[PDB]
Amino acid sequence: SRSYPCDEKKQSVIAECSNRRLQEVPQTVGKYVTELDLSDNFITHITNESFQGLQNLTKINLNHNPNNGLNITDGAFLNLKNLRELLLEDNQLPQIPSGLPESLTELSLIQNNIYNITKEGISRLINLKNLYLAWNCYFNKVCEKTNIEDGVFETLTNLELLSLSFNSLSHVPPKLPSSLRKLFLSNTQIKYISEEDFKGLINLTLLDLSGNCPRCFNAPFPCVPCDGGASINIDRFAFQNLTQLRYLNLSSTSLRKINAAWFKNMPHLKVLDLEFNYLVGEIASGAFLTMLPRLEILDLSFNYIKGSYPQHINISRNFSKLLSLRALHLRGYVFQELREDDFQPLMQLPNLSTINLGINFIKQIDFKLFQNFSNLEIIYLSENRISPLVFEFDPHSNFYHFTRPLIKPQCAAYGKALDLSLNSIFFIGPNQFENLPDIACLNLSANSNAQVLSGTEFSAIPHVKYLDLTNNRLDFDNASALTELSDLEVLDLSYNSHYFRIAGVTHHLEFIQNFTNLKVLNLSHNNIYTLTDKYNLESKSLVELVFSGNRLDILWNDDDNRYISIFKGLKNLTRLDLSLNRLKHIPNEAFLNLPASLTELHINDNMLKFFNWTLLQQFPRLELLDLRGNKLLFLTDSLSDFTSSLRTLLLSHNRISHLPSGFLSEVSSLKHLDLSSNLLKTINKSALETKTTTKLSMLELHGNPFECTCDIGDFRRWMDEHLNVKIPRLVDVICASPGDQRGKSIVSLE
Amino acid sequence: SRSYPCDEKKQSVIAECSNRRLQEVPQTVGKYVTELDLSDNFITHITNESFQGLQNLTKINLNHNPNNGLNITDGAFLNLKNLRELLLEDNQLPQIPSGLPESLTELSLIQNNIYNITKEGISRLINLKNLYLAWNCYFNKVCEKTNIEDGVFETLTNLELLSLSFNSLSHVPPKLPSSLRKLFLSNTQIKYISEEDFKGLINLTLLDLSGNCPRCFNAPFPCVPCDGGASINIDRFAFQNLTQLRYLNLSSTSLRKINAAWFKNMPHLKVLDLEFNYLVGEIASGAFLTMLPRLEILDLSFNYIKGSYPQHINISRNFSKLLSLRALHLRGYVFQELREDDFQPLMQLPNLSTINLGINFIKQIDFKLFQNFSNLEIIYLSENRISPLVFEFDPHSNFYHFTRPLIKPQCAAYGKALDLSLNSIFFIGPNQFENLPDIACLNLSANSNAQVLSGTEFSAIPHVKYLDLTNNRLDFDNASALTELSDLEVLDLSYNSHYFRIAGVTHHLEFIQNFTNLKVLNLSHNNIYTLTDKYNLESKSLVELVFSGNRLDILWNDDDNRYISIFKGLKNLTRLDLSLNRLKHIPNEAFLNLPASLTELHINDNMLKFFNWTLLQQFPRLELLDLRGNKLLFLTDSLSDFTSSLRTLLLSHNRISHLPSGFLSEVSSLKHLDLSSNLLKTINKSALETKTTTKLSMLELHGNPFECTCDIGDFRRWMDEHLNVKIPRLVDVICASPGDQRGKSIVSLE
């Protein structure tokens, strides 16, 4: 039987049951399911009958029920003897639920209203490994200080991760187990760390003390400093027996002085986070740095002195002792000029590959200095002032910075990367890139550049392979633009509409043909509608063209023949994106002039009232056809005559009200047909009557206004007989009529 | 009886019947209707019965039927003895329809397939005043040269306007009537104008010869030059008896020489259009200019020499004879520098108020020169390179330029206007605005400006009253910004999100309180989510704040109290726009802190699941409440208790499925209720049972999924009894169920 209301799969056997507007635990969950995701529903009661039929359950996710809190009886879960992981986040629970199964290894109660951690709630959960209680009382929420019963955690002798961040604690809890590997005490209003607080935790590898005595100036949240904005006070012997520490987080602890003796017995420390402190003085002196010869990542971001814009950054000679350093983050220091000598102390560090100076309002850099480093791989300078050379917070993320790569992994994969995005290099003059390493990945996005590139600007870094020029005002008025970069493989010119949008200025895209290695070109959002002299794009190498957000409705206007072969000269093209081009119809001859090598064609989010399915005959390699978001009415009845390659056909958000006799099971090759959000009232006997067989494995139908009379029987019957063809989200495959069926699944009817 | 399918009104009595998917002329049009708009439908046949019941018809509009052309029998209109205006544009008519009523004064057949203008079609329409036949054969359309029967127009002795633009004619037609005031022959492929062509047209006030021998380089359409790109050839005596000419259009006629003798007998010429020619030489010499002392508007745009970027513009001394000149357009000449002396010849012209140098790639201007003009009002410099001081075409519009004002009328209404938008004044230094007139309207939009304004930058033009700073990268980091402009009434800071989006930099909006005359402030699209030190906006004058496209979901996050009074200090505010702020709910206390002076509140296009209607009690002046585009489910049953001011309530695009008993006719004051595109299945007896009376005059209901059973009877009955309450577009107030009603109007059912 086709499972309902959950979607299932085998991975442990997972029941996807999230976000289906369920009002209670469905009683119809499969008895082989090991993992049950019921998150984001409208469930209000959990009782001992809620999971009665499901003792193979090892993982239950009830996060965010309902969307006025979640009501859980004493020992509602007690009979699930195999339950290991119970997620109850964001449920407005007033208490730890009573009578939780002793088999629990993972319990998350993040984002609730729990101000009392009790022996009765917890001390019997002796198998706990990971306990999350964070974000229960914080900011300006109306809540109580957290009462932690003396010794509530001491019985949990296999506990490896304890998180109590974003609660009011005032003190580190006594009687923590020595099994701890990771202790999260961020934003807990603890002012003082004594010798006793951590003395027993010889297995700790991570300690997070960030946000206690925070630095509150310009904070993007409600922020309460320690009296007189004082530092956190950490006893000299506080970290004495923390010999296995790898991660230390002291962001926003208002630190002015770092005690070198803190690091004495921490030979393995790998990642040290010191953001949002007052360490300008310490960065210039930094005795503690001599204690950290294994440190790989040091984050000193946002240590700026309120109100100062000094000329230069001052880095201690002691940075030269950070022998293992791989990345240094120095965002938000704030300074005017970077000179070669200012970074002398970093230049011999053999593994320093990332230097991050984002958001420093830097006006001038002595570029030649970077090449004197051993080998930088990522020279991140985004969001400065370089100019021509002359609940709101994700509880499961990092709070103090974004976790994403600095440079797009696709670009950094080519080699050495320089990101000068979000500056003011509004004009690249003859000497701008002198004395740089062999840059492979260059980001010049959002530099207000309005120049006419002409074939010489990048001559001093001629091996750039991935060039990001997005979001400038580039004037493409010279056929030699960018031709100096003969290794260029990826070129992104997105959002340079400034001059293209003006009909009366000239526009030249002829340089595209000059590249022998160009694979991917992005011309998106350029409002391209007129070119000068040469009307066609030509490349013998190009594999992918993104032409979304242009004016193909104008270029292919029925009265104009000039752009009828605009893409034909792209002899190697396999992927073409023509979304967002306002197209009502594509002239037959223009469609036939698309590259016959295409395997993937997107024409989604236009206004197509017409598609000539017959022309698919000229595309024997076409596998994916994306026509989502149009106004199409008519499906051909003879698709198998027109293609034997097409594997995925996407037609959601159209106006199809009729599937033709023997439509699906038209093409052997068709695996995925998406017909969601169309105007289907019914699917007939004959529309699926084609046999045999179907390679069809997915058919999406949600969002159609189905008429649920006996006329739905043949499709319902079809569904039972083709359990191999997955129909997702049956909860949303809904009857629009008649009145008494309105709102029900089509699957729920006699 | 409530009219259907057309909407009616009294103005002549107009039946709005356009764009309703009508498949034929409805037989149910009211017999008092004088004007019938049936444009943009799917009508395919017009016969003699089509209007049988409607002899009061003076105006019929059939433009764009259908959306495979329009089929019109011989004399289908002949019985409409009062028909004066017949619009048949865009209908794919192969011929002038036969047997048109002799009462016609206006006939438009623009955008058809008519290549034959015949005596049989036309010569009897002796009352014609305006005849439009333009855009039948043009560009790369597959079409025939136009055959104009000898003397087909000579019988039409009251013809005042003839348009044959965008057809292939090759020759000016002989035997035109001398009644002509306006003759449009643009893009007609006429190469030669002889002495005879116009000799009889002594009433002509406008002649359009543009686009014959066009200048084709970089044209945004299919463009065919005259042999060897030669000029149009105009006989010396071609304009000899055109003594009443006011308008002359010779754009894109490939002119290199203007014959002064052409203007000899044209003492009234007012507007002369010479765009897209080759007149750089003529502009530097220009004997013809001495012949035009009454000319008010001269357009010499786009006369650039292909490939040249000269240093300076060269204006003949003879420009000083254009005594009447009011506006001079010199876009697209192309030059580097503007010096004081280059415009000497314009400086004594007493009425020259507009100078337009858009799109010249000008790098440097000697600003002091403008003040030496008699009185410029509009100094338009948009789209240059100034930097810190050191069917596609609308047939009813102008083809060669846009018709809209150069400067927004709201800004130009304050006084002298300087538009420096779309340049590169990326930093306003101490001297940038020295030696300018008293500028009231300043446009600095899209200059890539990333400076920290600080209270001195505009000191040399301190009486700016309307300042457009949109689309820059402004760093609002100083509380004194803009305070030098103490007369400022309108300030537009839209699309300056660059720094606001960065949490870790400081942000200051305190300057807002410093203005005693500030009326309108636009902070749209700034991604505002965090401010430094001061969390509130304060002004004792501000009447209108646009805060759309910001992050009030973040500012008003339930755990943060800091922005709970963000708008309260706007003591004078009557209009507040909080659209596009991602709001799920507004905290009660934040809503109550909105200015009590509001008369107009927009919270449309958010994600509101909740609205506290009770809080409307604190807004006794509130008249318009806009909550369109949300996810609201719940309408209060007691609105009259909460407001007696509200006149317009907009709730389209929500999820309302229930109107409460005695809802509408809740508030006496409510005139306009918009409930379109919600989830109403029915409207009950009791929902409208409130009596008496209703000031309700509009109720929008289209787009609801109405259940058309007998349960719709009470509303249908209600509609008959309240003919005063207009329900628009009944065609689109449609039954969703049951099956046999699906698609019908609710008004069409037993």
Ligand SMILES: *[C@@H]1O[C@H](CO)[C@@H](O[C@@H]2O[C@H](CO)[C@@H](O[C@@H]3O[C@H](CO[C@H]4O[C@H](CO)[C@@H](O)[C@H](O)[C@@H]4O)[C@@H](O)[C@H](O[C@H]4O[C@H](CO)[C@@H](O)[C@H](O)[C@@H]4O)[C@@H]3O)[C@H](O)[C@H]2NC(C)=O)[C@H](O)[C@H]1NC(C)=O
């Ligand atoms: C103070 O500084 C320390 C750094 O020393 C920070 O510690 C990190 O805290 C974050 C957030 O709380 C932790 O990140 C989360 O880790 C979860 C577990 O990851 C482990 O398991 C996976 C495989 O399951 C491994 O790949 C991984 O390396 C670990 O072994 C992840 O499951 C989380 O990801 C999930 O949620 C995020 C939500 O955004 C999604 O983006 C993910 O795609 C996925 O759904 C998340 O990555 C992190 O592990 C901690 N570091 C360490 C070393 O333990 C503190 O956060 C910082 N304090 C503050 C307040 O900022």
Ligand SMILES: *[C@@H]1O[C@H](CO)[C@@H](O[C@@H]2O[C@H](CO)[C@@H](O[C@@H]3O[C@H](CO[C@H]4O[C@H](CO)[C@@H](O)[C@H](O)[C@@H]4O)[C@@H](O)[C@H](O[C@H]4O[C@H](CO)[C@@H](O)[C@H](O)[C@@H]4O)[C@@H]3O)[C@H](O)[C@H]2NC(C)=O)[C@H](O)[C@H]1NC(C)=O
């Ligand atoms: C060569 O140069 C001449 C200028 O000398 C141009 O002539 C103009 O041509 C345009 C477009 O064809 C005409 O503009 C249209 O005029 C219609 C009639 O306007 C009269 O009536 C109204 C009141 O009814 C008065 O306000 C007005 O001043 C006139 O008395 C308008 O109805 C049109 O507007 C309608 O359509 C446009 C479509 O975009 C809408 O925007 C409007 O809101 C409205 O729906 C339109 O304004 C213009 O009148 C001609 N000028 C003269 C003086 O006659 C040629 O166009 C140019 N040739 C080419 C090819 O560019």
Ligand SMILES: *[C@@H]1O[C@H](CO)[C@@H](O[C@@H]2O[C@H](CO)[C@@H](O[C@@H]3O[C@H](CO)[C@@H](O)[C@H](O)[C@@H]3O)[C@H](O)[C@H]2NC(C)=O)[C@H](O)[C@H]1NC(C)=O
């Ligand atoms: C311009 O278009 C280019 C090319 O399409 C865009 O880059 C491409 O972005 C897509 C995602 O939009 C990347 O694909 C994704 O990559 C990840 C990682 O492998 C994968 O998990 C996803 O399933 C998906 O495949 C693709 O790699 C990337 N290609 C390149 C060459 O970088 C680019 O983002 C566009 N520019 C702008 C401003 O939108």
Ligand SMILES: *[C@@H]1O[C@H](CO)[C@@H](O[C@@H]2O[C@H](CO)[C@@H](O[C@@H]3O[C@H](CO)[C@@H](O)[C@H](O)[C@@H]3O)[C@H](O)[C@H]2NC(C)=O)[C@H](O)[C@H]1NC(C)=O
């Ligand atoms: C920033 O918001 C300002 C103020 O709301 C915007 O200006 C205003 O724009 C509206 C139209 O959006 C103008 O109202 C319209 O004016 C015409 C002419 O009277 C009228 O026909 C319309 O019915 C409507 O009233 C309004 O006058 C104008 N106000 C001012 C002071 O200029 C401005 O456009 C916004 N900026 C951006 C970039 O969106």
Ligand SMILES: *[C@@H]1O[C@H](CO)[C@@H](O[C@@H]2O[C@H](CO)[C@@H](O)[C@H](O)[C@H]2NC(C)=O)[C@H](O)[C@H]1NC(C)=O
């Ligand atoms: C070039 O720099 C721009 C701006 O820093 C990067 O744009 C960011 O891209 C990421 C992922 O694509 C988005 O999450 C950010 O929102 C973007 N930021 C902005 C301000 O646009 C771009 O990714 C960088 N290019 C490369 C190749 O790494």
Ligand SMILES: *[C@@H]1O[C@H](CO)[C@@H](O[C@@H]2O[C@H](CO)[C@@H](O)[C@H](O)[C@H]2NC(C)=O)[C@H](O)[C@H]1NC(C)=O
């Ligand atoms: C300031 O200059 C900008 C750019 O020229 C003007 O923006 C144009 O505004 C009109 C009507 O608002 C739109 O039709 C155009 O699309 C806009 N163009 C662009 C490129 O944004 C703006 O209107 C000018 N400001 C004033 C006060 O006149």
Ligand SMILES: CCCCc1nc2c(N)nc3ccccc3c2n1Cc1ccc(CN)cc1
């Ligand atoms: C990481 C940034 C921290 C705070 C900050 N915000 C800004 C900002 N929005 N614009 C600036 C522009 C130039 C220099 C510094 C800042 C700045 N800064 C540093 C700063 C330096 C100096 C002053 C004025 N005394 C104010 C601010």
Ligand SMILES: CCCCc1nc2c(N)nc3ccccc3c2n1Cc1ccc(CN)cc1
């Ligand atoms: C009204 C404009 C007409 C054609 C044009 N288009 C452009 C353009 N896209 N960028 C320019 C940038 C600087 C100078 C001139 C142009 C230019 N120009 C003028 C121009 C001048 C000079 C040259 C190169 N010989 C090419 C083009």
Ligand SMILES: *[C@@H]1O[C@H](CO)[C@@H](O)[C@H](O)[C@H]1NC(C)=O
């Ligand atoms: C949970 O349900 C029980 C009904 O047995 C009730 O007594 C209790 O008040 C409920 N909790 C909430 C928050 O309503």
Ligand SMILES: *[C@@H]1O[C@H](CO)[C@@H](O)[C@H](O)[C@H]1NC(C)=O
């Ligand atoms: C480096 O640290 C040592 C402690 O080992 C300290 O005494 C010295 O002054 C530091 N160097 C500088 C330049 O401050």
Ligand SMILES: *[C@@H]1O[C@H](CO)[C@@H](O)[C@H](O)[C@H]1NC(C)=O
């Ligand atoms: C630098 O990195 C490599 C790992 O690729 C490691 O073998 C080497 O020991 C490192 N050198 C230092 C000083 O840490």
Ligand SMILES: *[C@@H]1O[C@H](CO)[C@@H](O)[C@H](O)[C@H]1NC(C)=O
């Ligand atoms: C492009 O500019 C270069 C250098 O500025 C110039 O030599 C050349 O004439 C231009 N190229 C073309 C094809 O116009």
Ligand SMILES: *[C@@H]1O[C@H](CO)[C@@H](O)[C@H](O)[C@H]1NC(C)=O
């Ligand atoms: C680019 O290619 C074209 C045509 O193949 C050639 O004429 C041109 O000189 C090339 N330009 C450069 C700068 O390599």
Ligand SMILES: *[C@@H]1O[C@H](CO)[C@@H](O)[C@H](O)[C@H]1NC(C)=O
């Ligand atoms: C065509 O694309 C493939 C895949 O990128 C590449 O191997 C080949 O070199 C390209 N062909 C040409 C002629 O550039």
Ligand SMILES: *[C@@H]1O[C@H](CO)[C@@H](O)[C@H](O)[C@H]1NC(C)=O
């Ligand atoms: C589809 O394309 C073929 C080839 O251009 C043409 O013969 C046929 O008429 C087209 N069909 C439609 C409906 O336009």
Ligand SMILES: *[C@@H]1O[C@H](CO)[C@@H](O)[C@H](O)[C@H]1NC(C)=O
């Ligand atoms: C118009 O209708 C008549 C039917 O009387 C038919 O003869 C004629 O062919 C029709 N025109 C078109 C274009 O179909």
